[PDB]
């Protein structure tokens with residue numbers, strides 16, 4: 180009875196696989212369809228009622244991965260598939276051997292590790308992937324600061340009878356961390372020991388953001404004299420402008436500034452000075468933009484942290500002050516969420532932001548943000564199959 | 576390059592599928608292997624680094640399912656696949672339409688719901704499975720009371736430098752719920768509004784526990800006079816003894832008692848009296864077993880809540896007092912965790928128990944529990960491919 184379903188889902192896996200393996204790098208659409216039919220097959224093998232237990236498996240799995248990562252198990256275990264006993268892991272990390280053995284049961288049956296024998300474990304490339312720069316920056320911060328709040332979205336909205344009371348300073352993050360009134364950045368930066376971990380997470384770029392989407396060379400060159408300036412607003416580490424300076428070196432003596440809050444500027448200031456970009460301490464919620472007439476004010480993965488009102492309009496207004504009507508442009512670089520057919524990649528980013536009062540925006544959402552701030556849309560720049568686009572704006 | 580891996584994993588999916596579809600109900604081993612190779616295929620399609628993002632997807636997915644379930648979306652949406660708009664769902668549940676739309680992005684791309692159109696959604700059998708009696712009893716309680724603590728296992732053990740400080744009254748549950756000193760049952764039963772939800776979760780039996788594992792007819796019949804008595808200790812709802820009375824009706828006027836704490840006895844007392852079983856208020860940590868010489872003292876899914884010491888030995892000692900040396904036997908009915916090759920089903924149950932100071936036990940773990948309490952093992956009853964067994968004990 181269930182055998183008939185398994186057989187059909189297997190057929191559709193084989194069909195999507197053959198399609199994927201003979202498309203050309205339609206490759207991304209054939210890849211998502213293959214992934215979707217492969218996931219259907221897992222669910223069909225489990226059946227509806229046992230598959231509803233997957234949430235409880237996923238929770239302990241995440242909990243174990245996070246504990247194993249923070250306790251040094253990933254670092255202690257030998258890379259390349261050589262095996263190691265629970266005793267030796269426990270001896271070198273300090274993690275209780277009894278706990279460790281119980282935790283490994285979540286990450287070996289399918290989990291990214293491999294059970295070589297009784298109390299004997301090995302890395303695979305799926306577990307070593309957590310030691311990689313983007314994962315190692317993103318996963319610890321998410322797991323220590325964001326997963327908790329995300330699970331409490333239900334409790335936050337229950338307090339308001341499932342109405343939207345979420346703000347930037349009153350949200351599942353402030354509930355979980357008991358910091359009502361503090362935005363997420365304020366609370367994290369309060370403890371300087373968090374700044375290095377948090378700035379590294381802001382630098383994580385798993386999707387490898389496409390920076391050649393916009394023509395920086397053509398527009399930055401035509402800027403004469405003082406106009407020839409780019410402001411990376413909340414540019415954090417500066418890698419955004421490093422890419423731009425690497426996409427347009429047919430240049431003049433251009434001014435490249437990266438602005439951010441004081442702790443972030445302090446963490447990166449020397450590395451940034453060293454590549455000829457100047458760091459600036461700036462708060463786009465407390466101050467007007469302190470650089471006038473610049474050719475471009477650039478915003479990458481900043482506006483997904485703030486609702487249209489009040490903060491969204493206040494950022495745009497604070498940099499509206501410094502702009503030239505016909506020589507300055509605002510560039511908003513962020514995910515553009517489709518109105519249909521969004522992926523789990525849209526969903527985990529949007530819903531994690533829901534916890535701190537942010538949101539990933541649709542095209543129509545960007546339209547309101549511009550309208551509400553009295554700006555005209557020059558052009559949306561998107562290279563389809565790219566999640567991000569660049570909203571190019573101007574004073575109208 | 577990655578195409579070669581996909582192709583091999585597809586081959587192994589097709590191979591395990593053909594094996595599964597021609598085994599006989601080796602069916603369970605062929606079923607787990609098919610599931611494992613199907614899951615490998617998903618991971619291989621994603622690649623190591625993108626698959627490490629699966630924890631963040633799994634977290635928002637669980638968070639959305641829980642919010643959608645608690646807010647009435649599952650109940651409001653039409654069963655059978657008919658579609659419904661975000662507007663109509665919001666109108667009938669009170670859940671903010673904007674939130675709802677963002678939450679549905681976690682549960683339609685693969686999640687159990689179906690995106691029929693823009694802001695248009697339908698049940699599938701995988702989402703309706705959450706309305707089923709076992710899921711509907713288990714998932715809300717887990718999600719409201721247990722998921723939070725599980726994610727804080729890392730924070731609890733960090734406090735002790737990854738040493739095992741977990742007890743029944745000092746654990747990730749007491750940390751998350753800020754109730755140091757209270758065991759999980761004490762804290763939940765404190766609020767009577769939790770008793771009905773919690774007792775229904777204790778009744779959830781997704782795996783459908785095999786009760787014909789032990790020969791109740793043969794042993795209960797030979798008990799003459801006062802010996803002919805079964806005590807379902809922490810029997811809660813009573814379904815355990817309903818099964819036993821349905822596996823052995825070639826009986827005398829046997830005494831069937833279900834013991835449990837006062838709130839649980841109050842919730843079920845009338846239903847239990849109605850089927851000829853007598854409810855008894857009893858606390859196996861504060862009192863000695865108040866029924867003497869009974870043929871069997873039966874413990875189903877109770878000892879996985881308590882460590883060997885102190886509570887494990889104290890339960891056994893408190894019922895040791897009431898036993899007859901050669902006419903009474905203790906039956907421990909619980910999961911038996913293999914020393915190798917455990918599944919995600921072992922792991923989610925064991926690690927969820929870790930949060931409250933419980934644990935699922937191996938065969939060798941049961942041996943210590945018996946030894947430490949001065950008991951001899953008569954026989955382990957296990958029907959392989961059954962996760963549970965029955966540890967039969969006697970005073971030696």
Ligand SMILES: C[S@@+](CC[C@H](N)C(=O)[O-])C[C@H]1O[C@@H](n2cnc3c(N)ncnc32)[C@H](O)[C@@H]1O
Pocket residue numbers: 364381382412413414415416419438439440443461462463464465478479480481484
């Ligand atoms: C998610 S990070 C994005 C950083 C960088 N543009 C990128 O894409 O990698 C958001 C940045 O905004 C900064 N930020 C938060 N609040 C700010 C404020 N009030 N004024 C200026 N920057 C702020 C944070 O310090 C952080 O570096």
Ligand SMILES: C[S@@+](CC[C@H](N)C(=O)[O-])C[C@H]1O[C@@H](n2cnc3c(N)ncnc32)[C@H](O)[C@@H]1O
Pocket residue numbers: 760777778808809810811812815834835836839857858859860861874875876877880
């Ligand atoms: C996980 S339920 C298992 C119930 C039932 N035997 C079954 O398998 O469905 C554990 C039960 O132990 C009970 N319990 C917890 N602490 C107890 C105590 N100190 N004395 C007696 N019963 C207790 C709870 O009320 C709950 O009904």
